Amino acid sequence: MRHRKSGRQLNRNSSHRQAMFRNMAGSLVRHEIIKTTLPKAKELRRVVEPLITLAKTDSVANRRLAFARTRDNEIVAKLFNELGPRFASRAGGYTRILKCGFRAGDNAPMAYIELVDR
Amino acid sequence: VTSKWFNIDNKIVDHRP
Amino acid sequence: AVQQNKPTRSKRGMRRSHDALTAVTSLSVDKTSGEKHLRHHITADGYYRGRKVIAK
Amino acid sequence: MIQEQTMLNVADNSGARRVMCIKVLGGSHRRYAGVGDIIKITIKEAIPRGKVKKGDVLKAVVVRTKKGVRRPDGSVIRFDGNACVLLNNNSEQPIGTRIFGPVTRELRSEKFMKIISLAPEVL
Amino acid sequence: MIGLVGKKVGMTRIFTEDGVSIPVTVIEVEANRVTQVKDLANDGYRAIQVTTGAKKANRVTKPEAGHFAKAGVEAGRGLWEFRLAEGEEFTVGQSISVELFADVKKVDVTGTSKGKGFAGTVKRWNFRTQDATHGNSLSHRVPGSIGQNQTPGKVFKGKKMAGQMGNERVTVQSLDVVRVDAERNLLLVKGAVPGATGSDLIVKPAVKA
Amino acid sequence: SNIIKQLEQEQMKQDVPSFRPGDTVEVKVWVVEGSKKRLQAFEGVVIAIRNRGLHSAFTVRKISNGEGVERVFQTHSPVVDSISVKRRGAVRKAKLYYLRERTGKAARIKERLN
RNA sequence: GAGGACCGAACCGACUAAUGUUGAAAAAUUAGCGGAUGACUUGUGGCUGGGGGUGAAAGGCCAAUCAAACCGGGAGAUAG
RNA sequence: CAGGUGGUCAGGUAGAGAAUACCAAGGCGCUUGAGAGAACUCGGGUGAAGGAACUAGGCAAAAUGGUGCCGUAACUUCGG
RNA sequence: UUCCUUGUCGGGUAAGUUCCGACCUGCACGAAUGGCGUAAUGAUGGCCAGGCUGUCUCCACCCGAGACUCAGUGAAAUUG
RNA sequence: GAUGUCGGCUCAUCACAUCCUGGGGCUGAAGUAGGUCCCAAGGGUAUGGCUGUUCGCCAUUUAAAGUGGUACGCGAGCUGGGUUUAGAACGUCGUGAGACAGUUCGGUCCCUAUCUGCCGUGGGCGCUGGAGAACUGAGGGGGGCUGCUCCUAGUACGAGAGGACCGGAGUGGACGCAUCACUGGUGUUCGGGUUGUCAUGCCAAUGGCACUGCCCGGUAGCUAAAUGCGGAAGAGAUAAGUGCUGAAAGCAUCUAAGCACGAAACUUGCCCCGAGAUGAGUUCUCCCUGACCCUUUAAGGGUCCUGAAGGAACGUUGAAGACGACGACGUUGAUAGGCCGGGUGUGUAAGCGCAGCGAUGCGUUGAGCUAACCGGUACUAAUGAACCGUGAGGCUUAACCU
Numbered sequence A: 001m002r003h004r005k006s007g008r009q010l011n012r013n014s015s016h017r018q019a020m021f022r023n024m025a026g027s028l029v030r031h032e033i034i035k036t037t038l039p040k041a042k043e044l045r046r047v048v049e050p051l052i053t054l055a056k057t058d059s060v061a062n063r064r065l066a067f068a069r070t071r072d073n074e075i076v077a078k079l080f081n082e083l084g085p086r087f088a089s090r091a092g093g094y095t096r097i098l099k100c101g102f103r104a105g106d107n108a109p110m111a112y113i114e115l116v117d118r
Numbered sequence B: 001v002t003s004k005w006f007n008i009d010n011k012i013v014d015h016r017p
Numbered sequence C: 001a002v003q004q005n006k007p008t009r010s011k012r013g014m015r016r017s018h019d020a021l022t023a024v025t026s027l028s029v030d031k032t033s034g035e036k037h038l039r040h041h042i043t044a045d046g047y048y049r050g051r052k053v054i055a056k
Numbered sequence D: 001m002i003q004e005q006t007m008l009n010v011a012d013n014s015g016a017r018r019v020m021c022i023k024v025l026g027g028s029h030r031r032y033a034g035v036g037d038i039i040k041i042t043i044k045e046a047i048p049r050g051k052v053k054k055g056d057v058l059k060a061v062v063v064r065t066k067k068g069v070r071r072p073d074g075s076v077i078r079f080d081g082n083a084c085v086l087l088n089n090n091s092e093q094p095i096g097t098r099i100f101g102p103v104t105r106e107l108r109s110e111k112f113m114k115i116i117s118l119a120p121e122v123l
Numbered sequence E: 001m002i003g004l005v006g007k008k009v010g011m012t013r014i015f016t017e018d019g020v021s022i023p024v025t026v027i028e029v030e031a032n033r034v035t036q037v038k039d040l041a042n043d044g045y046r047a048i049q050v051t052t053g054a055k056k057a058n059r060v061t062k063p064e065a066g067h068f069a070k071a072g073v074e075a076g077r078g079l080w081e082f083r084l085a086e087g088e089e090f091t092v093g094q095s096i097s098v099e100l101f102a103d104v105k106k107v108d109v110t111g112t113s114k115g116k117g118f119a120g121t122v123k124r125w126n127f128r129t130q131d132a133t134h135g136n137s138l139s140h141r142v143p144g145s146i147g148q149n150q151t152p153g154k155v156f157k158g159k160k161m162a163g164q165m166g167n168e169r170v171t172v173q174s175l176d177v178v179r180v181d182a183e184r185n186l187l188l189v190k191g192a193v194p195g196a197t198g199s200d201l202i203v204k205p206a207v208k209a
Numbered sequence F: 001s002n003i004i005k006q007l008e009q010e011q012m013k014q015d016v017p018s019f020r021p022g023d024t025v026e027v028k029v030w031v032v033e034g035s036k037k038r039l040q041a042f043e044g045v046v047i048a049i050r051n052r053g054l055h056s057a058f059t060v061r062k063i064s065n066g067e068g069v070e071r072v073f074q075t076h077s078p079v080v081d082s083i084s085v086k087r088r089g090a091v092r093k094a095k096l097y098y099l100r101e102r103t104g105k106a107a108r109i110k111e112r113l114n
Numbered sequence G: 001g002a003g004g005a006c007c008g009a010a011c012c013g014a015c016u017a018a019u020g021u022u023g024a025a026a027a028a029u030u031a032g033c034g035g036a037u038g039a040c041u042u043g044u045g046g047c048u049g050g051g052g053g054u055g056a057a058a059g060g061c062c063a064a065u066c067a068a069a070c071c072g073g074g075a076g077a078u079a080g
Numbered sequence H: 001c002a003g004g005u006g007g008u009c010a011g012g013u014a015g016a017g018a019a020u021a022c023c024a025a026g027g028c029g030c031u032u033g034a035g036a037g038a039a040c041u042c043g044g045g046u047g048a049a050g051g052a053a054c055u056a057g058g059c060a061a062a063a064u065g066g067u068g069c070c071g072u073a074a075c076u077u078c079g080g
Numbered sequence I: 001u002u003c004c005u006u007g008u009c010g011g012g013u014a015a016g017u018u019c020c021g022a023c024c025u026g027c028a029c030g031a032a033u034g035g036c037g038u039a040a041u042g043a044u045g046g047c048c049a050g051g052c053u054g055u056c057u058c059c060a061c062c063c064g065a066g067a068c069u070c071a072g073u074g075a076a077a078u079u080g
Numbered sequence J: 001g002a003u004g005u006c007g008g009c010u011c012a013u014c015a016c017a018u019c020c021u022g023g024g025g026c027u028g029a030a031g032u033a034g035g036u037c038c039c040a041a042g043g044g045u046a047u048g049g050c051u052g053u054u055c056g057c058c059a060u061u062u063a064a065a066g067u068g069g070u071a072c073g074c075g076a077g078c079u080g081g082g083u084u085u086a087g088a089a090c091g092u093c094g095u096g097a098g099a100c101a102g103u104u105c106g107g108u109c110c111c112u113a114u115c116u117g118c119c120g121u122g123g124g125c126g127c128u129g130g131a132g133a134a135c136u137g138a139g140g141g142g143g144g145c146u147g148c149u150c151c152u153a154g155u156a157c158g159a160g161a162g163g164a165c166c167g168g169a170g171u172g173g174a175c176g177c178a179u180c181a182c183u184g185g186u187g188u189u190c191g192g193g194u195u196g197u198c199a200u201g202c203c204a205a206u207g208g209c210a211c212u213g214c215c216c217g218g219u220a221g222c223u224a225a226a227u228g229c230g231g232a233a234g235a236g237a238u239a240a241g242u243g244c245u246g247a248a249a250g251c252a253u254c255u256a257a258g259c260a261c262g263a264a265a266c267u268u269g270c271c272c273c274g275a276g277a278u279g280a281g282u283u284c285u286c287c288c289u290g291a292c293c294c295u296u297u298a299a300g301g302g303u304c305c306u307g308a309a310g311g312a313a314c315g316u317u318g319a320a321g322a323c324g325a326c327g328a329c330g331u332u333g334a335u336a337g338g339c340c341g342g343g344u345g346u347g348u349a350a351g352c353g354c355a356g357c358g359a360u361g362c363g364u365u366g367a368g369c370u371a372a373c374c375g376g377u378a379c380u381a382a383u384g385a386a387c388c389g390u391g392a393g394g395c396u397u398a399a400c401c402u
């Protein structure tokens, strides 16, 4: 049974999921639109959107908390200097998923996930 | 090739001596 | 285990009566581009529901 | 939750120090004895000049368990170890004259009124 | 007597004045609207059909919507029936509330149990497992034997095997009614009833003693 | 669960004093010995608290007559007559289950003073 | 500063269990296990040949073959 | 092709160490992937109360585990 | 090494066809195809105890690799 | 040109020559408790010590610890202790090679399921216009066990000792169903402590790796050892048995005619499946009211116009689920994610200040962080469509209206 559990295992172990969504969180911040598989694009919303609400209030403690979760100072700098102020009046829902076709190599269903103002 | 390993084994083959 | 008698070409095509592929029925046309795409998917040139979502 | 092969301390001054449960009385395929349940035991260790000697087969009543007892409001009372009081095999009356440590109120039945009265405290 | 259709709100407890805590299930019984009455002449048996709850107008079909319109009732989330005992009579449009259980002492609650999916024989039928060690080969929770040799040469109907567990109708009988609360449409029964929270429940007075 | 919460508020006690793990507390519980109803006191160290509204509970451990006794009380049950804090203790944890293996001078809890 | 001494990696082995058994593998893998300055172990070259060799001896080994190797011949042995 | 294959080189921090953990120089991610999150199998983690009652048998697991000091019986071939 | 045989007596256990000590009625021990002892040693056989535990009572949950679905490639034993 | 062996495990299923529970007749049956026979197969019917053992002996229970069949049920379900390969030894036999239902120590157990069977779960067509619900119940399955205490009553019975039937009440054991409010387990998706090392320029603060590095707590969900419920009562027809009336046979006689009792067995009653029940049933509601041509003139074929109720597909997903299926929602919108407010868990964050030589302590401060929970909120994704499904539904007869 699986009743009322949340999250996708995505055929990885615990530490490899955590690293993978940390790398993909930075890639979406840096480029503002990336292409990934549809299950991975949906599980990304629950990682990247909590960072943008953390970045709405600029503080030394919030920056050290965004760093502990992104481990990239270029990403932390952009979150607090550009994205946070840019989304300051939006109440959640910072990303948008658009389904595209199927990956050629293995027929994976693909999607684009981007920030809403790009 | 050789015989299958269960067809060589005495325990499997020799069940009714 | 393995079969005792060779199955017939009729039993082989009865088993395959369920293996048929089904075609896509709903192919939508975009409101501005006027071209076809899968429903709820972006068009091949980057449109979705009238707006150019992807400058590729 | 006492079953066969459980070791129990003894809560009276009959002479036993440790006893082993060898049968949970009162039914076929019965598994566990809670507080206030009669069990058949054997004596594993005893003091040099007690009323009972090592290797005897007696009855006993469980008075304390680590599993504990439930109360009607949802409460629990747990102890640090399992203890029992030796009973005569035939009369089922206590062999010792003192009781050590508290007992609980499930011993409040006409059978075990001598245990309730000697106990230092009843929770 | 007839029963009523409710909804499982959850479990809680009731503390009594003498320090007993009664575990209760809370069942929300809104008013049940009578939508059709069946009689021996037209239908061959005596029963009432009731509806409850609400349904959004865009999700009720034309065949269903015209059924409610003839009864003069607002659409509910479903339809259920109850057999009428001799000497009970109802009328279309009449509403029935939880005060019907005011003097009832025990009830029977039927609902759909929680679905456990495809379950094995250890979970489904309490089969004993085999040894975990001592040489066992790939057979730790498997069912064991399923028949005898050449006589009868087959497996019997009703053999206990793994398969779909749960997600079926279950009736629990002889549950005490702890409190009927007509103002808030509640009924409190002692103990646990089948289903998940938010599931439909049919509550009826107990048939046994 | 608006329905459940307001069925729950009407039963909760309003006079529950504030206490935390490590505190020495004395709980007085109604005991019925035949016909008469009587109060009996249980004093010990709070080692665990569960905060769930009406389903709140707390565990007290005392050493009586040579053997430790742990009693789990339900906070809002009418068996519980009164709760009173005798001493405030200083601990870093929320559950003091490590006191189960310690005894005597090793089980001492420092007082809070503030 | 002795020792077919002691604990223990490389190195040499193979006591137990699980896996595998149309295998990843015609004998392995994982987790533990034994010896570990010696009657030790290993590279290169050499010698012993089939009723023969060699054997701290199990009828063991002698090219995945051993109570008598493999190849060719007698040979289309004989077969109630 | 999860096997076999002789020699030379031999950095840091902890360590007795060529063990073990994390790293350098350097080299790789093992030539099918994407989903889901049933039984059952495999490899592991934790477990109330009990504690060998399991079984052919404590098999397998769990436990013990270092250094310094105190202390250490029968028996003995006087070394253990 | 003893068939009768689970000999009999004692010990250990609540209960001991095994184990230990004895007796001798040795079917069918016995003196270099050695007898009787024996400290140390043994991946050696049997028995007991302490510690420890999912071995069990009686299983529950969790983490991964398969099993299941999708796209690609694509076997086998067997068979009137 | 192969039908694997004893015992154990797991899972069973039948018979009745009945071990318990149920109903009776006789007793050398006062009562309690028995003995013996008849009826009855609904349910139930031990845990351990020794031993490879089945068996047996023993210990302690139980209402009782049934007897048999099923390839002495069950190895394409497990084991491999015994037996029964190759090694080695003892006793004995043999000159010897060797032998011994004599003993002893060691010793490879393969199979990805085509068919039938069984357990679950769908697709097609049918049921005669199409569609959406709610039903009826032919038929099938599940369940059925029992102890002790108290009252009756120290009554009946008995010299005493002892000690009831019938009836009622309570509380257990084992088994089953559901559930998660409580007590708990888990909780590698939450918080914290801490060891070694590497990095983020360094300090401070963090992150990776070491089995989740090791540990300590713990949310939802799942769950038992947790806690609710169940086995019935009653009815019908009976078994053995007991009768009433009553001839044959002036009497007697339960039987021949007639009438009445009588058990956990049977049929119901209770729970669940169920119209593919092809004998394919019923009720309510919803929708479609156009032309034309042709031949082989018929339940005929085609063309144009039209496309209804509804369905599917797609999308957001679920206490539903292997996949199908099932449930909810798709802007006239709380379906999921985020966000906002709470709760819960952990246990007083970082920064800064103060005290101390320093580890460290104190203040700001029950702070900060907080998964799956609760109450809300259109911020993001759930699109205008298109697709399937038609256009009044055969013949004969009867009864009514014309």
Ligand SMILES: N[C@@H](Cc1c[nH]c2ccccc12)C(=O)O
Pocket: B004, B005, B006, B008, B009, G021, G027, J108
């Ligand atoms: N069963 C094992 C060992 C084995 C190899 N050959 C055998 C011949 C007979 C018996 C066993 C074997 C295997 O197949 O790998």
Ligand SMILES: [Mg+2]
Pocket: A011
């Ligand atoms: Mg995969």
Ligand SMILES: [Mg+2]
Pocket: A015
């Ligand atoms: Mg890790």
Ligand SMILES: [Mg+2]
Pocket: E137
């Ligand atoms: Mg194997």
Ligand SMILES: [Mg+2]
Pocket: E136, E137, E138, E139, E140
């Ligand atoms: Mg296994």
Ligand SMILES: [Mg+2]
Pocket: none
């Ligand atoms: Mg047949």
Ligand SMILES: [Mg+2]
Pocket: G005
């Ligand atoms: Mg040496």
Ligand SMILES: [Mg+2]
Pocket: none
């Ligand atoms: Mg060798």
Ligand SMILES: [Mg+2]
Pocket: none
């Ligand atoms: Mg190895």
Ligand SMILES: [Mg+2]
Pocket: G008, G036
């Ligand atoms: Mg060594």
Ligand SMILES: [Mg+2]
Pocket: none
């Ligand atoms: Mg030989």
Ligand SMILES: [Mg+2]
Pocket: none
């Ligand atoms: Mg060879």
Ligand SMILES: [Mg+2]
Pocket: G074
């Ligand atoms: Mg010739």
Ligand SMILES: [Mg+2]
Pocket: G076
């Ligand atoms: Mg020839």
Ligand SMILES: [Mg+2]
Pocket: none
């Ligand atoms: Mg290689």
Ligand SMILES: [Mg+2]
Pocket: none
């Ligand atoms: Mg080498």
